[PDB]
Design a protein around this ligand. Structure first.
Ligand SMILES: CCCCCCCCCCCCCCCCCC(=O)OC[C@H](COP(=O)(O)OCCN)OC(=O)CCCCCCCCCCCCCCCCC
Ligand SMILES: CCCCCCCCCCCCCCCCCC(=O)OC[C@H](COP(=O)(O)OCCN)OC(=O)CCCCCCCCCCCCCCCCC
Ligand SMILES: CCCCCCCCCCCC(=O)OC[C@H](COP(=O)(O)OCC[N+](C)(C)C)OC(=O)CCCCCCCCCCC
Ligand SMILES: CCCCCCCCCCCC(=O)OC[C@H](COP(=O)(O)OCC[N+](C)(C)C)OC(=O)CCCCCCCCCCC
Ligand SMILES: CCCCCCCCCCCC(=O)OC[C@H](COP(=O)(O)OCC[N+](C)(C)C)OC(=O)CCCCCCCCCCC
Ligand code: SF4
Ligand code: SF4
Ligand code: SF4
Lengths: 192, 126, 69, 115, 181, 240, 321, 48, 112, 136
């Protein structure tokens, strides 16, 4: 038999002790008048508050001297995009257009056809680096690891035209950062 | 008749909830509103309505528990719907509902049926 | 890592001209074991000092003097 | 909670005649604040044209017949007034409202690409 | 429990020698850590220089080569169908009972009754003309009691703790800490 | 004062092959399904004049009512002790242009009393008003202000209805399906006028609609039956 | 509160998908459901104090934020917008040695809260800025839909991690704090308690972490591993269709709420049997709070308004979704 | 093993309850110190 | 329905005067043998005689001034599409789908 | 280098972290100011909506010369995730002149400091007074 008889539930029932006791009056304060006034007139907690702040003055600060030092990075970090190659030198991308279809922001533009020697290669490949949200979906979807995000973050440009990376630019990044891409790929290969 | 009851006190010891002060006369006030609701229910709502049976189910039940439980803490744990100060507002709102429930005549035929294409989503009837 | 002793030891290990450069771009006087130099010419050190804080155990010495990129 | 300045309750009118009294009343309210509209919005035109262009937009809807269309065009009628009074729109918006502006021959549209 | 912990049991840099004794003599709470992580412990093998060779984890029933037919574990296609109960079906259930507690005749006589509630039956009329025991047994509960809103968590209860147990603010501060019970 | 352990080097558990049971996730809601079904019917029996129909999905109970049945059912669910939904969490809508009344206004109520959530669905057209629940729930003042801004629904009884999200003097209600995702206009700074001006929309790269390459096969089946065996009409058994 | 945001979309979609995350995945979403809660209160409590005047407690906590964002970046690759939690579980497994860093941070973090409670909890200037400011009654809070801390300050003991436990929140043991005065000082105390209850859950998730898959073992809703993709034909087909066509969600609708750090955050997602949501309404706690600002600020001074905004935690991305 | 897991025996417990032990003399003693300094101070003022 | 509902939608006047919508049901694709995308009715707008697409000079994008290029509506009944088009006062034209003619197919027919 | 606290959205969180103890923008003489009168750098950190656009121009006009503007993150740069929205300006350089663009979503704190360092290198290359003697 449940408490539907009184339109009550287990959930509606408050725990024991839920009702507050009678609030104390001025005659039930444990502190004497002088103790309460010595703390009040001599700013007891403020002088403590100063003292705790002064403890920090004799501690080692946290600041690092960028650009002479860098904060930690991990192999999964997402930064600047780069198009990679095989060791033999052929471009890794087979113009499969997967990354273009995942890309949440539609930052990728791929135009492809059969190469001069028959290969399935891309002749136009742009990333609108001012439209990308640096999300890593293109990297996850590439079947041949052709498009990755290098750990670079220091590439701020004076003009916005310089942030429209075309296929020449991205392949030049893949050559520049190939060694660092291998650092991250070797470390985080099994986790993908 | 002119019986004026207090629903929400504006001063007194707190109850643990902000704005809900302790009620000076918990038990008598509940009994007055339970008796009124049982009385005022039959004045306006006919018997075939399930809602009338539902209120008389527990408004009777909450009226019998209050009488036999002088200790407030025994009232709360047996009704099981919060503090006694809350039960006053439950009882009060239970009373206001019948004045509107009778007016709406909400035991009758469905006033406005849905169109044949209303509760269909993407080509399936719900 | 902030006491003048840590700056004294690093000042003596490097010598003047190396430390004067760090007093010009680095703002801190550090000394560390040289690890390697890159194609641009920057030299990368590692700090063995037991008092150096967590993220400050590696640093660079840029090729230029008045500017760093 | 209390409503903001120059606010009104949203009631769906059911009589045609009742609406026109509200519609006509609202028209002077636009006209009354016209000088203040110029002063508060620093408009480059005298208040006469401000009164001029208010009237035209009322007539644009004059010939609606069905009632449910009448209310919504009145509900949105009040809202545009309320925003204008309380200085909620910026000077850029109001200028562009009154700064708005014969079709080309067939050869001319054909010559420049048409539509 | 969350009792205070000696400073040398926390992974932060701490003083040694004469300065440790100075630090304990002058600090308000001697077991407070500076917060600077231990250089020799914190992230010492970086995420890119670990030793663990990761292997893809696979629970047996859903990763096996055998006894692993996909239609057994294809839950996305076993989703609950959407059924809406109109007034008519409530009336039919109310008058005729349920599939578990039948109140319908058998054979063609029953097939007559089910077809009655195969077209519009307003529920206002159904409650007007039916046994009052039906409402007390089907619609309402426990002999006419109402139906309280069901609880999303039948195990959601609370109880009052005290500072000797919950460790937080003492009784004077204007908040109370609720346990599970 | 023992030296701190090097947590990298401490031993780790060894596991062989892992086993995890496979069972339908919709099964664990079975008890919740019956109780919402009972309590859903209870509201319908109490108010047959208003509740058109009720539906249960897993642990969510929906009550479908007409626009003229809104204030009544909302009041009942707020004041009735068996169902004290004092807190209204969400007021929204959805556009289904195929239906005669496209907009589908949905309310979510929370009962901190009994730890329950209920949903009210009521339809609306483009011109037909809907009662405002602001007199009951003060928290719907802005949720109704937002629905009008993004759906253009007329809310009758709202003390102050106006744009809350879109710009002042924004033309069109964005979440209506006929409104294009990129809108109609865009702004730029005009040198001659010394002010930011609106111009008609013109995208340097037109939006690419990859949604055309959707699945040509139906992907999910007819579903499964999880109605409690106490809410199905019994089959009249055959005769001897 | 980045990861709890994407946890409420994952819960809603998995609810529509009739799928359940495996055991390890749920612990990770509880582990980073509380790291995210600590991240939020360090941003909210300490920026609230900064408006009131206390500049230093802001700085101390934001180094803990730097230490916590390192865990965000080490598992997902981004400090802020980690698309880590997804429908079906999490993106990738935890990197080796992450648990040993969450622990080493956890041993010390308790002292970081004390040094914050040193400057603020007992400060008479702080209590003059908050005690009696922005009072909310329980009746008013339920009416305006105030949720999270601006409902337990008013004395109501309600919490969504208890009402509808989700993602391993039913396994760990933790308490909640309930106010009694409904003012800014009560909400300050409750948040400082929610700090220490997060540090109590975080340790348990470090000790109870199980082995196994972090995502549904269902390649029709979760991408197959790259190694299996490049060697098994059916993995390549599913990898192809998951990243171009998407996965279909059975038709219907849902309303999934979680106990976000700000309050009750919920989404109303409508599915149509397709691979794209038909509707997605987002119920942001801040949006419902900001409506009640007029009802609370009535009868207060300009320096008191600054306190009420901070005690509401108004990040206006959620308000202006 | 081949995943990030806690040790066999788990991690040691950490500190998460409030740790703010009070410090300083009793309030009466500070008042006695104040009236000693005031008394001695006016002794030296009155001497000069 | 009968009302001029477009006067409350705030849509630009050009959708009534200058654009033509089309009510159609998508046809079955030759490449694939699935028959599910051809069961819902859709509304799409005609392209513009100029300015529908033009090559961006800098990066070779596809610029456009048509704000309805990526707007396709879905329905489940033909009437709902026509009613909705009527409500907005759209200048539409309906494309009746072709109906495949039934032909019985027998295994034995290869010899008889 | 006193910027103006013009944080709009999630890009502002990384802006505050530059001032946090780890990076400590103040150590380089960078103090965020709350007024155009006391600021010479405008940092657009977040999404620029249509409704916010006229206010951004007004705040920009009130900064005394010399002034520089930095665009941080993908929203300010070119719309970003919200490029195809009805209420988002596709690049703040449609409203104010931008001197340097910081890429990312959000740019890391070091990425923002690289943008600030790059601009300072440009400011040190100015020849405002030698221009008068030679170009004028
Ligand atoms: C640089 C300038 C100089 C700075 C130093 C200044 C020093 C002078 C300070 C002035 C006051 C000094 C005397 C303090 C002692 C007298 C006050 C006292 O005794 O307490 C108030 C007393 C009430 O007693 P109460 O403390 O409340 O007992 C509670 C027990 N639980 O109240 C009473 O009942 C009697 C009060 C005493 C009557 C005479 C006064
Ligand atoms: C009871 C107070 C007793 C006062 C002390 C008197 C004293 O010590 O005398 C010293 C001096 C004068 O004494 P003198 O003539 O030099 O005799 C030779 C002493 N070896 O005395 C002096 O010259 C000046 C003494 C000043 C005393 C100031 C008393 C304290 C001031 C009020 C304290 C209020 C605290 C609340
Ligand atoms: C001497 C000259 C320098 C200090 C001047 C100011 C004195 C302040 C204390 C008196 C007021 C009061 O109320 O004192 C009493 C109070 C509170 O005691 P409680 O909370 O009841 O103790 C609890 C119960 N016990 C007594 C068993 C412990 O103690 C304090 O908070 C002491 C604060 C000491 C640190 C601040 C001093 C350093 C500041 C910078 C110095 C360069
Ligand atoms: C007889 C011995 C004489 C001693 C004279 C010294 C008195 C000093 C003031 C004491 C009274 C007090 O702190 O008062 C507190 C007042 C007003 O408080 P209130 O509105 O009355 O409420 C509280 C009292 N109740 C509940 C009983 C009504 O505001 C404050 O927080 C002022 C704090 C100022 C701190 C400034 C920084 C300090 C810098 C110097 C150290 C580095
Ligand atoms: C009433 C006002 C009182 C004076 C105010 C004080 C102003 C502060 C000074 C600004 C300094 C500054 O700017 O120093 C740095 C700048 C900028 O260097 P850069 O941008 O890299 O180009 C410069 C380097 N190149 C061109 C080679 C790339 O020049 C310098 O490197 C100066 C280098 C030579 C300095 C010789 C100094 C001679 C001794 C002077 C003292 C005995
Ligand atoms: S990271 Fe994401 S947003 Fe950027 S290009 Fe790749 S898929 Fe597109
Ligand atoms: S996913 Fe990889 S292979 Fe396919 S188009 Fe993109 S870069 Fe090329
Ligand atoms: S660019 Fe990314 S991080 Fe910056 S405001 Fe836009 S969405 Fe937020």
């Amino acid at each position: 038999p449940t408490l539907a008889l009184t339109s009550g539930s287990i959930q509606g029932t408050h725990p024991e002790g839920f009702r507050l006791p009678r609030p104390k009056t001025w005659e039930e304060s444990s502190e004497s008048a002088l103790s309460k006034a010595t703390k009040w007139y001599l700013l007891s907690e403020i002088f403590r508050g100063l003292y705790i702040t002064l403890e920090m003055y004799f501690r080692a600060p946290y600041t690092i001297y960028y650009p002479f030092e860098k904060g930690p990075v991990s192999p999964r970090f997402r930064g600047e995009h780069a198009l990679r190659r095989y060791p033999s030198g052929e471009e890794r991308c087979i113009a499969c257009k997967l990354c273009e279809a995942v890309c949440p922001a539609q930052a990728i533009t791929i135009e492809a056809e059969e190469r001069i020697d028959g290969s399935r290669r891309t002749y136009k490949y742009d990333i609108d680096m001012t439209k990308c949200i640096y999300c890593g979906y293109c990297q996850e979807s590439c079947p041949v690891d052709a498009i990755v995000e290098t750990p670079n973050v220091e590439y701020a440009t004076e003009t916005r035209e310089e942030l429209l990376y075309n296929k020449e630019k991205l392949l030049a990044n893949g050559d520049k950062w190939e060694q660092e891409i291998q650092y991250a790929l070797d470390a985080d290969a099994p986790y993908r | 008749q002119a019986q004026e009851i207090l629903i929400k006190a504006n001063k007194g010891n707190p109850t643990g909830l902000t704005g809900l002060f302790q009620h000076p006369s918990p038990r008598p006030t509940l009994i007055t509103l339970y008796k009124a609701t049982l009385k005022n229910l039959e004045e306006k709502i006919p018997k075939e309505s399930v809602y009338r049976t539902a209120v008389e189910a527990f408004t009777k039940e909450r009226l019998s528990i209050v009488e036999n439980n002088e200790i407030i803490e025994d009232i709360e744990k047996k009704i099981g719907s919060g503090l006694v100060e809350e039960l006053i507002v439950q009882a009060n709102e239970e009373y206001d509902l019948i004045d509107k429930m009778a007016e709406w005549k909400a035991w009758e035929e469905l006033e406005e049926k849905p169109l044949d294409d209303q509760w269909t989503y993407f080509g399936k009837k719900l | 890592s902030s006491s003048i002793q840590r700056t004294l030891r690093n000042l003596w290990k490097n010598g003047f001209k190396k430390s004067f450069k760090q007093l010009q771009g680095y703002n801190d006087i550090k000394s560390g074991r040289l690890v390697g130099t890159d194609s641009f010419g920057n030299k990368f050190y590692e700090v063995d000092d037991p008092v150096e804080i967590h993220m400050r155990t590696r640093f660079v010495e840029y090729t230029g003097f008045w500017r760093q990129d | 909670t209390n409503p903001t300045a120059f606010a009104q309750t949203t009631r769906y009118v059911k009589d045609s005649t009742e609406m026109r009294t509200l519609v006509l009343n609202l028209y002077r309210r636009y006209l009354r604040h016209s000088r203040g509209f110029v002063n508060n919005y620093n408009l480059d035109i005298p208040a006469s044209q401000v009164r001029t262009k208010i009237r035209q937009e009322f007539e644009r809807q004059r010939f609606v017949k069905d009632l449910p269309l009448k209310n919504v065009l009145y509900m949105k009628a009040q809202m545009e007034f309320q925003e204008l009074v309380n200085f909620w729109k910026q000077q850029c918006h109001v200028m562009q409202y009154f700064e708005s502006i014969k079709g080309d021959s067939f050869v001319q549209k054909f010559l420049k690409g048409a539509q | 429990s969350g009792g205070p912990v000696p400073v040398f049991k926390k992974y932060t840099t701490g003083s040694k020698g004469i300065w440790e004794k100075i630090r304990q003599l002058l600090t308000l709470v001697p077991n407070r850590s500076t917060g600077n992580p231990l250089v020799k412990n914190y992230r010492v093998p970086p995420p890119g220089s670990q030793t663990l060779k990761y292997k893809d984890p696979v629970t047996i029933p859903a990763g096996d080569i055998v006894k692993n037919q996909y239609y057994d574990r294809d839950h996305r296609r076993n989703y609950p169908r959407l059924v809406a109960f109109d007034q008519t079906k409530v009336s039919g259930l109310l008058t005729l009972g349920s599939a578990q507690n039948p109140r319908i005749s058998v054979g063609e006589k029953g097939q007559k009754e089910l077809a009655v509630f195969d077209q519009s039956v307003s529920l206002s009329s159904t409650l007007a003309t039916i046994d009052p025991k039906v409402v007390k047994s089907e619609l309402l509960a426990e002999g006419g009691s109402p139906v309280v809103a069901p609880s999303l968590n039948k195990k959601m209860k609370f109880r009052l703790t005290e500072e000797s147990e919950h460790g937080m603010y003492p009784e004077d501060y204007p908040i109370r800490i609720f346990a599970q019970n | 004062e023992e030296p701190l352990p090097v947590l990298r080097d401490l031993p780790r558990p060894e596991y062989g092959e892992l086993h995890a049971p496979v069972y339908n996730p919709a099964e664990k809601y079975k008890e919740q399904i019956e109780e919402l079904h009972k309590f859903g019917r209870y509201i319908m029996g109490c108010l047959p004049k208003f509740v058109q129909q009720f539906s249960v999905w897993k642990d969510e109970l929906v009550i479908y009512v007409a626009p003229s049945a809104l204030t009544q059912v909302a009041t009942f669910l707020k004041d009735h002790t068996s169902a004290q939904f004092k807190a209204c969490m969400d007021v929204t809508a959805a556009d289904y242009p195929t239906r005669t009344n496209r907009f589908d206004v949905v309310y979510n109520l929370l009962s901190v009393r009994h730890n329950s959530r209920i949903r009210i669905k009521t339809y609306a057209s483009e011109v037909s008003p809907v009662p405002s629940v602001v007199p009951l729930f003060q928290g719907a003042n802005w949720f109704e202000r937002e629905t009008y801004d993004l759906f253009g629904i007329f809310f009758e009884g709202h003390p102050d209805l106006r744009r809350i999200m879109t710009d002042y003097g924004f033309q069109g209600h964005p979440l209506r399906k006929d409104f294009p995702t990129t809108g109609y206009t865009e702004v730029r700074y005009d040198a001659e006028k010394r002010r930011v001006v609106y111009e008609p929309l013109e995208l340097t790269q037109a939006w690419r609609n990859f949604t055309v390459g959707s699945s040509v096969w139906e992907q999910v089946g007819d579903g499964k039956d999880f109605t409690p065996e106490s809410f199905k009409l019994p089959t009249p058994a055959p005769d001897p | 509160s980045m990861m709890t945001n994407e946890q409420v979309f994952s819960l809603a979609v998995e609810k529509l998908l009739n799928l359940e995350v495996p055991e390890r995945g749920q612990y990770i979403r509880t582990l980073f459901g509380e790291i995210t809660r600590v991240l939020n209160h360090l941003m909210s409590v300490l920026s609230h104090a900064m408006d009131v005047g206390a500049l230093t407690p802001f700085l101390w906590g934001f180094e803990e934020r730097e230490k916590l964002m390192e865990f965000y970046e080490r598992v997902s690759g981004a400090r802020l917008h980690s698309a880590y939690v997804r429908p079906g579980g999490v993106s990738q497994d935890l990197p080796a040695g992450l648990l040993d860093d969450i622990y080493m941070w956890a041993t010390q973090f308790g002292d970081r809260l004390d040094e914050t409670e040193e400057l603020l909890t007992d400060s008479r200037i702080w209590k003059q800025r908050t005690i009696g400011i922005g009072e909310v009654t329980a009746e008013d809070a339920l009416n305006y839909g105030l949720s999270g801390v601006m409902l337990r300050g008013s004395g109501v003991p309600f919490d969504i991690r208890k009402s509808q436990p989700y993602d391993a929140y039913d396994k760990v043991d933790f308490d909640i704090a309930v106010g009694t005065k409904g003012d800014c000082y009560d909400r300050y105390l409750i948040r400082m308690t929610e700090f220490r209850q997060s540090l109590r859950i975080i340790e348990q998730c470090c000790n109870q972490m199980p082995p196994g898959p972090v995502k549904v073992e269902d390649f029709k809703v979760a991408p197959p591993p790259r190694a299996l993709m490049k060697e098994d034909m059916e993995a390549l087909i599913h990898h192809f269709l998951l990243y171009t066509k998407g996965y279909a969600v059975p038709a219907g609708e849902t309303y999934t709420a979680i106990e976000a750090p700000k309050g009750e955050m919920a989404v109303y997602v409508v599915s149509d049997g397709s691979e794209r949501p038909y509707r997605c309404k987002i119920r942001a706690p801040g949006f419902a709070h900001l409506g009640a600002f007029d009802h609370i600020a009535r009868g207060h001074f300009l320096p008191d308004a600054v306190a009420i905004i901070g005690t509401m935690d108004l990040v206006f991305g959620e308000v202006d979704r | 093993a081949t995943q990030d897991l806690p040790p066999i025996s788990g991690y040691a417990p950490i500190q998460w309850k409030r740790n703010l032990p009070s410090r300083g003399f009793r309030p009466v003693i500070w008042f006695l110190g104040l009236c000693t300094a005031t008394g001695y101070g006016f002794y030296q003022i009155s001497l000069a | 329905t009968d009302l001029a509902k477009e006067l409350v939608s705030g849509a630009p006047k050009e959708l009534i005067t200058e654009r033509v919508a089309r009510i159609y049901q998508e046809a079955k694709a030759a490449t694939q043998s699935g028959q599910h995308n051809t069961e819902t009715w859709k509304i799409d707008w005609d392209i513009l005689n100029k300015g529908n697409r033009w090559e961006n000079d800098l990066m070779g994008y596809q610029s456009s001034s048509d704000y309805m290029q990526g707007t396709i509506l879905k329905f489940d009944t033909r009437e709902g599409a026509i009613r909705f088009a009527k409500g907005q006062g759209w200048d539409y034209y309906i494309q009746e789908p072709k109906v495949r003619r039934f032909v019985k197919k027998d295994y034995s027919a290869n010899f008889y | 280098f006193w910027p103006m606290t013009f944080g709009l959205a999630c890009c502002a969180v990384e802006m505050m972290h530059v001032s946090a103890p780890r990076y400590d923008q103040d150590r380089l003489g960078i103090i965020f100011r709350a007024s155009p009168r006391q600021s010479d750098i405008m940092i657009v950190a977040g999404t620029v909506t249509n409704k916010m656009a006229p206010a951004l121009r007004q705040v920009y006009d009130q900064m005394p010369y010399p002034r520089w503007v930095i665009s941080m993150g993908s929203c300010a740069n070119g719309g970003g995730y919200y490029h195809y929205s009805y209420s988002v300006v596709r690049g703040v350089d449609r409203i104010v002149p931008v001197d340097i663009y910081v890429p990312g979503c959000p740019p890391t704190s070091e990425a923002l400091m690289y943008g600030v360092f790059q601009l300072q290198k440009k400011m040190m290359d100015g020849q405002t007074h030698r221009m008068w003697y030679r170009s004028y």
